[PDB]
Amino acid sequence: SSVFVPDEWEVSREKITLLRELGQGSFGMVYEGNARDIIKGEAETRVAVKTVNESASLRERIEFLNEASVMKGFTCHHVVRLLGVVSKGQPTLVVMELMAHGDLKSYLRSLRPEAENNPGRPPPTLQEMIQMAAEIADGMAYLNAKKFVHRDLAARNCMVAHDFTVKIGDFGMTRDIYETDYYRKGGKGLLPVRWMAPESLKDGVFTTSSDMWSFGVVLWEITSLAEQPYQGLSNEQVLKFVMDGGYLDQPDNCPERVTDLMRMCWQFNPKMRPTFLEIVNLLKDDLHPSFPEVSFFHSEENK
Ligand code: EMC
Ligand code: EMC
Numbered sequence: 001s002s003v004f005v006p007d008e009w010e011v012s013r014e015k016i017t018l019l020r021e022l023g024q025g026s027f028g029m030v031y032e033g034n035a036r037d038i039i040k041g042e043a044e045t046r047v048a049v050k051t052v053n054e055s056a057s058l059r060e061r062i063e064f065l066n067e068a069s070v071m072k073g074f075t076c077h078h079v080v081r082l083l084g085v086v087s088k089g090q091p092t093l094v095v096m097e098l099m100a101h102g103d104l105k106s107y108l109r110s111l112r113p114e115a116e117n118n119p120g121r122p123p124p125t126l127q128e129m130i131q132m133a134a135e136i137a138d139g140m141a142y143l144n145a146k147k148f149v150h151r152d153l154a155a156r157n158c159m160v161a162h163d164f165t166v167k168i169g170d171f172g173m174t175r176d177i178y179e180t181d182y183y184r185k186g187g188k189g190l191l192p193v194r195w196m197a198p199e200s201l202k203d204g205v206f207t208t209s210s211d212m213w214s215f216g217v218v219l220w221e222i223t224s225l226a227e228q229p230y231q232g233l234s235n236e237q238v239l240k241f242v243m244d245g246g247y248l249d250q251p252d253n254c255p256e257r258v259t260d261l262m263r264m265c266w267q268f269n270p271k272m273r274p275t276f277l278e279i280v281n282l283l284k285d286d287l288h289p290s291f292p293e294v295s296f297f298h299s300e301e302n303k
Contacts, residue, residue: 002062003069004087011038011084016093018049026172027064028053035095038083047083050094050171061092068094074146077294078139080159080169099167101160104132104218105178108155108226126255127286129222132166133261134283134291136218139168141276142296144208145303151206153214154195155221156181180228183235194229198242199270209270215279216248216265219258223251277302 004010015036022030028051035047052064071082071094086093101107110117111124124132136158143150150157150168156178157170174182174190182190185201193201197213200206217229229248230238247266250259261282267273274282280297292298 001066003066005069005072005082005085009072009082009084010088011035011086011093011095013086013089013093016047016049016086016095022048023171023173023176025050027051027056027060027067030171032098033095035083038095045083046098046100048096048098048171050096051091054091064094065092074143074148076139076142076296077165078135078167078296079142080167096169099159099169100162101164103170104155104158104160104166105221105226106156107160108221112225123225124222126258128164129219130258130283131287131291132164132222133219134280134287134295134297135166136168137215137276137279137283138295138297140208140211140215141280141302143168144211144276145296145301149206149208150211150214152192152195153211153218154181154192155218155226158218183238185235185239193235193238196242197270198245198268201239202243207270208275209273212265212273212276212279213270215276216262219262219265220248220251223254 015038016033018031018033020032022032024030031049031051033047033049034044036044038047039045052061056064065085065087068082068085075081080099081097082094083097084095086095109115110119111121112118140150140153153168157168158166159169160166181192181194183193185191185193195214195217197210200210220229230241233241245268250262261274261279264272264274277297280295284291284297296302
């Protein structure tokens with residue numbers, strides 16, 4: 001059932017130029033490209049362009065476009081957004097905003113003291129960490145408001161803009177440089193075990209509450225510059241540790257307010273964990289002045 005985006009979201013094919021491949025997405029390759037006159041005030045804009053694999057069935061091709069129509073309804077400064085779609089002709093293209101600094105996991109790793117790709121920037125300050133935290137929690141609040149359960153929130157699944165704003169978004173690369181971030185629990189499916197709440201591991205259920213747990217892990221990744229959670233434990237060990245009530249070690253030289261927030265996320269009982277809106281409420285008093293201008297939290301949409 002092909003459901004198409006509004007006229008405003010259709011992009012003339014001639015306005016998109018694919019430049020190089022960024023990597024694999026759920027339906028196929030993702031490319032970095034240029035889109036002309038796609039954003040007001042900009043003659044050209046760097047974008048990420050998704051396509052469906054040429055081996056995909058018609059059904060999968062239709063599903064690829066229908067998903068873009070869904071993603072079209074996710075409009076929040078703290079969520080990577082759909083800029084447009086070339087639905088007519090082959091191949092169909094879903095144009096997404098390109099985050100200048102890529103995913104958060106790779107960005108954090110580049111900030112390490114001896115990283116070869118170190119931007120010449122210092123690891124995030126307390127202030128920047130709290131800002132990132134509120135942006136992530138805010139985008140997740142928006143998504144949860146849309147009844148979306150991420151199921152794989154992690155720094156690898158967040159992206160960094162040119163001004164360092166962190167947004168919820170990923171192309172669909174479970175298998176990538178981060179394949180090791182997933183494990184076939186019981187020889188079954190690939191699960192992001194080191195990011196999963198104890199109840200998800202034990203019963204396979206995922207909720208916004210399990211998303212909150214993962215959010216705590218993301219905060220932890222910011223503090224550790226994205227080390228592997230429970231790096232000293234094997235996948236099997238992580239399963240037992242976490243199901244037994246274990247959680248990550250409180251980061252060093254980090255305020256009680258922050259570590260406590262992390263501890264709340266890691267509450268064993270999902271019911272005891274904060275909601276994403278509560279997370280933002282908790283950090284709202286010390287954020288960049290633009291925050292109220294763009295957050296779902298301070299929006300008329302937060303109902
Ligand atoms: C303004 C809703 Hg993120
Ligand atoms: C990344 C500051 Hg506790």
